[PDB]
Amino acid sequence: SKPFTCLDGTATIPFDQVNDDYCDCKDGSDEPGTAACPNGSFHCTNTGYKPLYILSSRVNDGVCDCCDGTDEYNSGTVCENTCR
Amino acid sequence: VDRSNFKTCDESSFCKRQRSIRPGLSPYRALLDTLQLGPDALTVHLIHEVTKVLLVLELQGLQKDMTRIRIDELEPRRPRYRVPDVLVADPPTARLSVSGRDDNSVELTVAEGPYKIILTAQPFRLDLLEDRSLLLSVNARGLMAFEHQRAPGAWEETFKTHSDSKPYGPTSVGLDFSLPGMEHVYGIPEHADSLRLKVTEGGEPYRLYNLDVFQYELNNPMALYGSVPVLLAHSFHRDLGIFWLNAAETWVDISSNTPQTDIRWMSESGIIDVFLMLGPSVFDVFRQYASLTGTQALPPLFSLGYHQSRWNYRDEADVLEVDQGFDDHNMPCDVIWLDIEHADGKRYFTWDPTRFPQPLNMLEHLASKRRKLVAIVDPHIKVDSGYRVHEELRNHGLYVKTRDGSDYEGWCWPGSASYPDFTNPRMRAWWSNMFSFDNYEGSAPNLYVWNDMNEPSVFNGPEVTMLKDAVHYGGWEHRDIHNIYGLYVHMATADGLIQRSGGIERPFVLSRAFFSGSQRFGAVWTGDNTAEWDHLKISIPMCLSLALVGLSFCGADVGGFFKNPEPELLVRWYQMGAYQPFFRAHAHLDTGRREPWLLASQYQDAIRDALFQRYSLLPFWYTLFYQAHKEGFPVMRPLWVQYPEDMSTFSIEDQFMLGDALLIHPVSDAGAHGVQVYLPGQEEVWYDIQSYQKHHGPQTLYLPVTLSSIPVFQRGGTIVPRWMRVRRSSDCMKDDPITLFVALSPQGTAQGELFLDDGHTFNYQTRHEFLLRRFSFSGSTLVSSSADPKGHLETPIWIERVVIMGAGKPAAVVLQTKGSPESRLSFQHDPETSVLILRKPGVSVASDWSIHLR
Ligand SMILES: [N-]=[N+]=Nc1ccc(NCCCCCCN[C@H]2C[C@](O)(CO)[C@@H](O)[C@H](O)[C@H]2O)c([N+](=O)[O-])c1
Ligand SMILES: [Ca+2]
Ligand SMILES: [Ca+2]
């Protein structure tokens, strides 16, 4: 099983350092699902409305940023789906 | 400012009388036959040789190396005022004994030494000694003056159009103190003046009388909104402090004379009650004073973030647009503020029915962003028979009264208004209960309070405040209590925010007027500054002078209150405000809107960067505030506090320190190309926290700057904790991992602390639910241990990164945690900067651990 690179070409890391809650890529590409990278983005799939991107700092911050609520998965804030 | 509104010393009849007494042989002498050594104190009678008025001197040696001097009349016609509620406790005494004597001298020893007090009988004099070293003298210039209560403008007196019936006649008290070897003094806020106090010999004394001064000017000794009667003397050899416990109008004279500084306090009424705090170090003085008046109240974490305010946000929609603007422009903010226009025609505890019809929904919208709100509540109550607050206070007789017995009525924002008597504890209890969620309708747990105009400001009153002859609880005159009226407001408000929570939630209250002991109740700010470069500059000496006297939670309006700052000025004010304790932008009603995203992107980006630097240092800011809360040590510090023997730091006020780890010299000149940074300390190093460049002290370094520069340096030997994941507010960040910044000393060592709790309750003291971590570096090992084992906390916070400045490349890095196998960590090293970064230690902050560089 192969390792992961980075969309900017700044290095390559083992596959266990993708979404491990530490920032290893200068462009933040290794942490799409966490709040670890300052310049990352989290993708809200948002079925039933427009898909949206939010800042990585708004993942598990306790605030509901996606209408589907998937940005809050381990924060103590439960977001109801509101894409209607 | 219009100076004719405010008395000079000559226009204050008691100031004129006192100041006319010039240095010479005192007519007071001590009757040594009357000497008595009691359980707590020494009492001896004093007599004026010409008038034969009899005074009583109560002399006390105190635990923690302090002396208290109290002088009152022997048989007074009526009682004199003694300041209540400011001392946190009855100060523990130390036994006095007579260790020397002659026909004109009694020498007293405090406990078993080395402190001694010589009481000279004729003329009356006091000398305080450590062993055979003279620390300080009392009445050495012979300036003791004590106007006894004569049998009922020395009496009735007029100023401008205002009349003082003055029923008790001249009653002022004054006393002088001599500081051998001291050439610098600091303290006695609030004045828009330099940190090092100036000699008053050829001009006005410093005035201490809480007053509302419209468009106040710089570098003058006029009294401002708060008064803390504490003066600090510093030399290469010792530190001392004088605490003149008096609540009436007080003037302070300062003269220099081998080097010596003399200090003379002159007060309108009450007794003489002064505390001499003998050090010897400045941190000993901090401790001595803290034991008397208390320590800085631990702020809830959110109040150490960024506050966005102005006079005024228009309606609920405006407030929510401001909230959304921060998030749309990726800028952190914790609190949005609501000035006087949010209420119904300046009737406090109300909401405008059109512009704020659903306050709970507004607060609920802010809670979902995990942000707070502050609403202003002033202590003047509109005289309005439809206003429920006014009807209750009038029906229960809780108002300040006039001599005829009717409730005092003055003028303020709602027009004609009455003033609750906050010196009456029944009134304070009423006020506190008013903040319960049932009484303050529309309030919610994320609504906090701002007390303004609590000098009190009275537009038609003398010097814009209350008449000297208004009457308060117990029959005391307003002239007796003036300077603690605001403190009572701040205290009652703060206790109300605690009570409405059932005693669980910590308060946040900002207050404009203040006194000794105000540090116990929240924050203060320097009132109505102006959008000008010199007002930006003066924020440092003003907050520094408040720091030295216990008020660590200080700030100035970012941007200036009056007028419109130019974009370069606003950026510099943000960078300055981001490194000062209370961090709030505020603005006058007629100024242009200056929310930070309304500027061009270059100014926006520099402002965003300053906000990010602030939010990342919150763990550091929070720890300094915990140390201020436990020890009495100031958060913002003059350089001479950290380098007491470097005489070139004694006057510096374009630079300051945060604890002992960060030295700050913000840019405060338009178009500056550089700054001159004095880095102190023999064999001390400093790290440019932007370039990681190391610099060797002592030196003056020319640092080039751009618009984005905030000149900040970390001291070698310190460890600073940061949250590198900046989010939209502090509530969002308070479970996030910490990064540790280790600046290595020249000996390869460093240390620092970290405090943690839930961020807002009193559980840290009632349940010991907190963490105090000590991080230490030496040899080649970083160790985390507990600095207080009583503290336990359930927290997800972990150590995600360690940044070490001044280190070589290791061959391996090894982590050891109790409960875990020995782990290997990867790292990066820049040979150009000698910066070492340890990747993802992954360890809980509650755990003990060590990292070794091989
Ligand atoms: N009665 N009425 N008649 C009037 C009407 C207007 C007047 N001039 C206003 C003076 C401007 C500066 C005021 C102090 N600003 C306070 C309050 C506040 O401005 C809002 O609470 C805060 O923003 C600020 O922070 C505080 O310092 C006067 N008047 O005699 O000054 C009487
Ligand atoms: Ca990673
Ligand atoms: Ca979120």
Summarize the structure.
By secondary structure, chain A is largely without helices or strands. Chain A is built from no helices and two strands.
Mind summarizing the main beta sheet of chain B?
A: 10 strands, antiparallel
| Count of structural domains of chain B | 4
Oligomer: heterodimer
Instruction: Give the percentage of residues in beta strands of chain A.
Output: 5-15%
The domain tally of chain A reads: 2
Compute the CA-based radius of gyration of chain A: 14 Å
Distance between the termini of chain B: 65 Å
Glycosylation sites (chain A): 39
Binding site for substrate (chain A): 16, 20
Subcellular location (chain A): Endoplasmic reticulum
Domain LDL-receptor class A (chain A): 4-38, 36-80
Describe it.
The complex is a heterodimer of chains A (84) and B (854). With 84 residues, chain A is mostly loops. Chain A has 2 domains: 1-34, Low-density Lipoprotein Receptor, CATH 4.10.400; 40-84, no CATH class. Chain A contains no helices and 2 strands. Chain A has a two-stranded antiparallel sheet. Chain A starts with 40 loop residues before the first strand and ends in a 29-residue tail after the last strand. In chain B, helix 6 packs across helix 8 (485-499). In chain B, strands 6, 7, 8, 9, 10, 11, 14, 16, 19 and 20 form a 10-stranded antiparallel beta sheet that branches. In chain B, strands 1, 2, 3, 4, 5, 15, 17, 18 and 21 form a 9-stranded antiparallel beta sheet that branches. In chain B, strands 31-30-29-28-24-23-22-32 form an 8-stranded parallel beta sheet. Chain B has 4 domains: 1-280, no CATH class; 281-632, no CATH class; 633-716, no CATH class; 717-854, no CATH class. In chain B, 18% of the residues lie in helices and 31% in strands. With 854 residues, chain B is an alpha+beta fold. Chain B contains 15 helices and 49 strands. Classes of the chains: A little secondary structure (84), B alpha+beta (854). At the A-B interface, loops of A face helix 14 of B. Bound molecules: ligand X8Y and calcium ion (2 copies). Residues 214, 311, 339-340, 376, 411-413, 415, 452, 459, 527-528, 586 of chain B line the site of ligand X8Y. Chain A: Ca(2+) 2 binds at residues 58, 61, 63, 65, 71-72. Chain A: It is found in: Endoplasmic reticulum.
